[model samples]
Target: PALTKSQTDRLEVLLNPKDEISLNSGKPFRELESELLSRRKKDLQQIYAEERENYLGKLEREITRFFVDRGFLEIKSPILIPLEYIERMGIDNDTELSKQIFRVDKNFCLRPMLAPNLYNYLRKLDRALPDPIKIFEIGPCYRKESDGKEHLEEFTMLGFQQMGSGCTRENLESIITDFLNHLGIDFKIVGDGDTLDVMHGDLELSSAGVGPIPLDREWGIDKPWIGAGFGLERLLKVKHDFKNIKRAARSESYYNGISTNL
Candidate 1:
């Protein structure tokens, strides 16, 4: 007799790497499974840094180092922001985008994107910093999103903004290309005008732009600027072909793409 459906499901969770496993006997095969699973337990449960650090911490650090080496200051900002920041990004209350925000009340909420905070830094920093000012951040952004294989309610972002004379659409293209190329990702920029999507096939790995946007004047920023905000979880998912993007995020149930309660 073949393995029972439940047994097959358990085998898959063990990462047996097969669509089907053939078994000629039920009782003897159960004994065989017990012996095999017992031996494999030691190997499977010994979680290492490669499983944990590589996907989350070390990867973020490597990208941080990449920007820091290129003269970009790493800015730290609050995760909880006033609702006005969302409106400043042009998300009006009546829009669907506004509905996706997790409201803390009527006036405050967690930040949905790092751009608003980056804008704050860019304007004030422009006054004190040198020309071609570059700044970046690596942090979490929250939203109320539909549950999907590729979506996470709380996701990490790598947001960067540069205000300088060199901040033109052409430079924006090269900048996004350079950033992705650094990670060895082959991507194409699609769209024009205010924003562009950096895509790996159909997956959007990043959103980038060069701006003299209307919001600029509101923040007292006049200089041309180039910026790109990357979804780090999506980047890892596409890079490694992760079955689910949640594996690349902060989670109590999974570590380094391995189940914790195994």
Candidate 2:
């Protein structure tokens, strides 16, 4: 139907100038809030997906290849571990360690670190396999971690164990240096001999140990071994200059060091 001249003029006024400028902006606050929330949720989902593909996915493959090339078997360790495993590693009584443990029940809890399980597996592999039993795992570890730039409640851990390798300090140093350098990482090693800390600038990236055969003896191991554990998120954080560890978590909460929350 054709509009009358007067009605058409009124319509043109609403569509043009001041009225048009404020049309969408005039929505009720609650309605606008709802729309924003919906939009943000979708945007976050896409962010996570893309980062998972382009960043996290590639990172995982590259890291796995790094270890696999060295003849280390990649194993998936259990996240829910027995309470005794924690005790065996000698951290069950430490105040800070106890507080961070996320217990599932009286008998078991989410693993706070990958070391205990790796040690247990190393023992088994040492018995069955020949010398230089090498193994590694990459997966989630949980803790009641505090809110901080460096910590996350749930994070990925990369742990590797080698038994009967006769790994000396120089050997371990070369291994770490080569790995980090392969990733174009500039880092430093702190400490000497048996224990060492791998630091990237100001942040500690990982800790490594060359055995005296004492710690392994507790696990009923007769041979010495060397091992190291690293925070995967920390590596990414340091490399990409992430201000918060959560940004490296590859979750919906953040994407490429940016918070998805409104």
Candidate 3:
């Protein structure tokens, strides 16, 4: 792509290594190129700073509160796991969703999701434990996906999985609604993996235009489970009607206003 005067002028300076694009540049890259790349990074960080406040921070707090109120215990899990477990679960390196897997030692790479580690925890727990094993985690998950509207190399996720009684669809939906309603967010539950394709907005009546279908696991299931995940930046984009994160979350203090400015 051709560079504009603004972008070009911005590019003539030595690039700061702290800028993401700088670290990835090939050796012997020109100073002008570094400057331009540095400017590009400045733009992105400005964007993320805004999104962090407007929706990401706020939603994270509310969602974590929802799980806590429901008695979901939080746990820290190891992201690095053995390669054999990944193969055993039918996870392949070729999938589009397989964004990252860096080697840790001879047998392990960074774990992609909390699911695998959480499942291991469940297996080790005493079998006599009571029903509805409520657990939740809000932390970063590593991946190679470059940060954008819906992608990040490393990003936060709120994960919850329950077993035994009270994990019913209705129960989960109620908890979901309570969290969303608190933020004035509305969503629709599309069964299976159909909703996974949606990249923007709260799941809504009009989002049906997204045109997605459900997915099934390779293994059998005696009962159903419901889970929902949202991209905090995308949520701010819709809630504030702003395409640029710098305009909504960064330009002004939004989280404080929305949460306490009654």
Using lDDT, give the best candidate's number: 1
Tens digits of per-residue lDDT for model 2, 32-118: 444544655665587666664545556777889999999888988789999887777777555688878888878999999998888
Q: Write candidate 1's Cα lDDT for 43-95 as tens digits.
A: 44554523534477767898899999988999989999998888878898688
Superposed model 1: Cα runs more than 4 Å off: 1-54
- Model 1 CA RMSD to the hidden true structure, in angstroms: 3.8
Judged by lDDT against the true structure, how good is candidate 1?
0.79
lDDT of each structure?
Answer: 0.79, 0.74, 0.50
Which pairs clash in model 1?
A: none
Least lDDT summed over 10 consecutive residues: which range in candidate 3?
205-214
Candidate 2 RMSD computed on C-alpha atoms after optimal superposition onto the true structure: 11.6
Task: Pull out the clashing pairs in model 3.
Answer: 11-35, 11-36, 50-250, 79-111, 187-203
lDDT of 2 at 186: 82
Per-residue lDDT of 155 in model 1: 91
lDDT of 3 by residue, 1-262 (tens): 4555564433423232233453333444355465554565565467667664535666677777777887877667776677665665566767764546655788887765565665555444425556556676666655666545444454556666665566555666566666557766555555462233222333321121111112213222232344444445445545665433322232232332121111
